[PDB]
Amino acid sequence: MDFLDRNAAPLNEGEWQRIDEAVVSTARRTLVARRIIDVLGPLGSGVYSIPYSVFSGKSPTGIDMVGENEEFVVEASRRATINLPILYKDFKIMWRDVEADRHLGLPIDVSTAAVAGNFVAVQEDHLIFNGNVELGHDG
Amino acid sequence: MDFLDRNAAPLNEGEWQRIDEAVVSTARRTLVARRIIDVLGPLGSGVYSIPYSVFSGKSPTGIDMVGENEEFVVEASRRATINLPILYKDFKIMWRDVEADRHLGLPIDVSTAAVAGNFVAVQEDHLIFNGNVELGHDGLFTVKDRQTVAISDWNETGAALADVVKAVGALSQAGHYGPYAMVVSPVLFGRMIRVFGWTGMLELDQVKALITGGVHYSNVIGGSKAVVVATGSQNLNLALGQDMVTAYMGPTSMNHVFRVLETAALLVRRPDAICTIE
Amino acid sequence: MDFLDRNAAPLNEGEWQRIDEAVVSTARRTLVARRIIDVLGPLGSGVYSIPYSVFSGKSPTGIDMVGENEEFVVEASRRATINLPILYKDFKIMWRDVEADRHLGLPIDVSTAAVAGNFVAVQEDHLIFNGNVELGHDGLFTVKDRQTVAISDWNETGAALADVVKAVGALSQAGHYGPYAMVVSPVLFGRMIRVFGWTGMLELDQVKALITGGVHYSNVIGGSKAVVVATGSQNLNLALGQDMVTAYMGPTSMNHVFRVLETAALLVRRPDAICTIE
Amino acid sequence: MDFLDRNAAPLNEGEWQRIDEAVVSTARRTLVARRIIDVLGPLGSGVYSIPYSVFSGKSPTGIDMVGENEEFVVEASRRATINLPILYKDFKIMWRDVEADRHLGLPIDVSTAAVAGNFVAVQEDHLIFNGNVELGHDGLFTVKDRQTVAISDWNETGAALADVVKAVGALSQAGHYGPYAMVVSPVLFGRMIRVFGWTGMLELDQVKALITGGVHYSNVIGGSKAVVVATGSQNLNLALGQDMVTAYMGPTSMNHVFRVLETAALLVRRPDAICTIE
């Protein structure tokens, strides 16, 4: 992916792997929704909005030796759409800490990244359960 | 030149070539001044200020069989220098539209850049017609030496031709023969679209036949005003420092911010070569 | 573009050529909007929805001697997105004829395909000009921030020219200079054909001298109304997904059913760039 | 093409050619219908009958997000078939005149051939506009599902324009947008040549601006009647069979005798495309 700048930053891959693992593990601890609800995708950055069918209707099932009838199609009661918001939060790693890890081996204070991961995970859950007014997302 | 980060923005040069085109094609649409007033330069970014002569006065010409007296030198009624400000506006290509180009193929919404280019061009015109108070510039409606003509009620037929004739009168008496050009606020320009007498053409066609440099219009000029110019680099020029260009500013937030900028200013070399009808 | 089964119909490619030309030669003779408004793309099949930016309102341009203030940023009045509907109608080639009139030496009767192309281009116009209620598409005659001019009684001479002048006033006041274009209901267009003044040429041609991007009519515009549009991809685009094409739909009985479709929507990028005379 | 028997006539190629050119050119000067109804074919030779379709009624049009409903079909409302009669007239060339025009140097008299061509073409037009009872053919004034408009007194100023506006209204209601063409009896056409009024143009030139397919006159439209046609091969056709040709038909006395023949028939694919003003 292009948008994700990972080369102008000073941090090595041995830092990135720690930071991402601290985010992933903090999410997997924090989240409730990805227990009750399955992940779809992931789809990449570029999908701004998704078309999705609404079924919301009760209809029978076919039961015959050859199944002549075609009454039994599942009907999309409405084929609506939704736009995918960004949830984000931002955190600083001090230049002192970077230069320390780059000479003295003192590891980055990735607890910042963990705190950001926790806060975005909380916002993900809040979006899912409570919805949001301004985005118009029903929850 | 290095002050514009043509390689630091994420955009490929095809997208640069679409963004510059989406600026230039709205500059050319929007600008009136460059149709009236000749461009001087462009000079490059470094030219922070320009000295210019102001021949506001009149002084006698010699006539002699011998050709000896030296009183008959032209002065410069004042000499002055004017500073070129930066005109600029910022347009903000949001980051996920880049990925939507990268993978969904739907190209970038450069219409932000077009709207910025329009806002820059409108500021260029606004500066040239009405010099900014804070910078202490003067423009064609603020120059104090200029000719003036009392505007009539152009709701009457032929009154716009009459006032144009007055303005060509005053310009001629100032020593400025044509070709004149004129710019009209659109509330009057609409009133110039009438049949005139039985002459078998519009009143505007009379004015365009007399004002052979053409009649233009802009909402930049206040309502019920017009300005008439004895065209040519002899009388007015528009200096360009850096001609209108697009410059990056790095990422601000995740989004990519770009600046459209131009440095230009009006030097009124002959303040008697202008009449405002008002 | 793969979902159209050129190979599953019985028709050979010469018989496809016949019917595609039968569609295109009826579309060209009826499409207005593609002559008023720029085609975006076409984006290709099934590009289901398009994000776009609406730039109503204004904010100040920066003029300063050095670039130090970041307030001067372009932001849309809203980020927006629109759903591309399908326009379609079907026609049913009878299976007998496909080898009956073959041995009459008749080329396949394409007449229903022409009728389908017609009804497609009619629904296209009806969507673009008049919007749609069910899909919620706003059209040129419905978008709420547009300019409006109260129409004069065009039974007078020059009244239509005066209303066109009013419309170009309301567009130019908003900073949208030409080339404009106009589309008029034929009940009005039939009264714009008048000899004007002593000029010896038509009021409609005076308008075309002013509205240089062209004047047109389509019966879709109900009653006495017209719309004047500041042309160009900066102001409006016709979004095309699937450009108009014919698609096979398999047998039915043994008769062959064909579909003609296009997917298109109106991108009102600038509501203020439109004025309706009504 | 055995029935032409061109070798059995005495005439050489240069003697024959002018007889065909005399026929063809007078047909071109006479055939009104082929200006406004498209020729189909010509087909084979003499082919006895053709199947065709009537698309009466007006199904709605598909605007939908998915394309689901299949009701939007051109519903072939009823099948039909028609038989192509021969139209013919015979012209006769005396052996005395042949010999005089071969030894006595005179050019061969062909003044009969063009009169046969004329009486043929006038019969073809009378067929197309008025049908034929004995064959059960119907024409533009006799097809049953056509629109009608009550003709006003075309001695009043503007009456013909107003009635054509009514007819174009009715065709618009049928969903036939243009281009329209129209054919008028001479008694009315001589009433369309008036100054329409202060509009300053002939009423006929108003109608020609509204009826862009052109206005025509013909003998076969008896009395105060006119017809308006939503042109194009999707609404009407003329099917020729054998396009107008001369056949040698064997001596009587020593006089050579020739036949001019035609096989055209009217296909009324959409009886709603026709309005008669009567």
Side-chain angles (χ1 to χ4, degrees), chain B residues 152-254:
Chain B
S152 65
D153 181 14
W154 289 21
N155 298 287
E156 298 191 344
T157 298
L161 183 62
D163 289 343
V164 163
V165 164
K166 294 172 189 160
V168 168
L171 292 192
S172 182
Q173 293 179 356
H176 296 290
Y177 312 141
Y180 311 115
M182 174 169 76
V183 193
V184 187
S185 54
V187 181
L188 294 182
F189 182 92
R191 287 175 168 73
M192 297 172 73
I193 296 184
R194 305 166 175 270
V195 67
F196 175 52
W198 305 125
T199 68
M201 61 177 64
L202 299 169
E203 181 159 359
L204 176 62
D205 298 321
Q206 306 306 338
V207 180
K208 286 194 184 185
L210 175 59
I211 305 190
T212 50
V215 178
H216 297 86
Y217 64 99
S218 179
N219 64 299
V220 172
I221 298 179
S224 76
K225 297 195 182 200
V227 58
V228 189
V229 171
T231 68
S233 62
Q234 166 58 355
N235 288 336
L236 303 176
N237 298 260
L238 173 60
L240 300 184
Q242 180 54 55
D243 187 17
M244 199 183 299
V245 176
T246 57
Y248 188 42
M249 293 180 49
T252 293
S253 188
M254 286 291 291

Side-chain angles (χ1 to χ4, degrees), chain B residues 25-26 29-32 35 48 83-92 94 96-97 106-107 109 111-112 114-116 118-120 122-123 127 132 134-135 137 186-187 189-191 193-195 198 200-202 205 217-220 249 257 259, chain C residues 40 43 47 49-55 57-76 79 161-162 165 168-169 172-180 196-200 206 210 231-235 269-270:
Chain B
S25 66
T26 292
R29 188 182 311 303
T30 306
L31 291 173
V32 175
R35 309 181 190 161
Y48 181 92
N83 312 292
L84 284 67
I86 190 167
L87 302 180
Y88 69 106
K89 191 81 179 191
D90 302 332
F91 73 80
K92 186 159 52 173
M94 290 159 178
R96 69 201 310 199
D97 300 347
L106 173 51
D109 188 6
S111 71
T112 48
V115 176
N118 175 258
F119 267 116
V120 172
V122 168
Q123 201 64 28
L127 173 63
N132 177 273
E134 293 179 353
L135 296 179
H137 281 216
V187 181
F189 182 92
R191 287 175 168 73
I193 296 184
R194 305 166 175 270
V195 67
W198 305 125
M201 61 177 64
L202 299 169
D205 298 321
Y217 64 99
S218 179
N219 64 299
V220 172
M249 293 180 49
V257 174
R259 180 158 290 183
Chain C
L40 169 64
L43 304 188
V47 182
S49 71
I50 292 175
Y52 74 110
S53 307
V54 175
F55 303 99
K58 300 190 69 170
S59 77
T61 307
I63 177 170
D64 206 354
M65 190 47 59
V66 287
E68 179 75 342
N69 185 354
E70 293 179 353
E71 285 177 292
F72 310 133
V73 176
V74 172
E75 294 191 351
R79 288 286 292 202
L161 187 66
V165 164
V168 167
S172 185
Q173 274 192 359
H176 298 298
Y177 307 151
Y180 308 110
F196 188 66
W198 292 16
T199 300
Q206 290 295 336
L210 173 58
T231 69
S233 60
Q234 63 197 118
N235 290 339
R269 290 181 175 179
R270 286 201 68 136

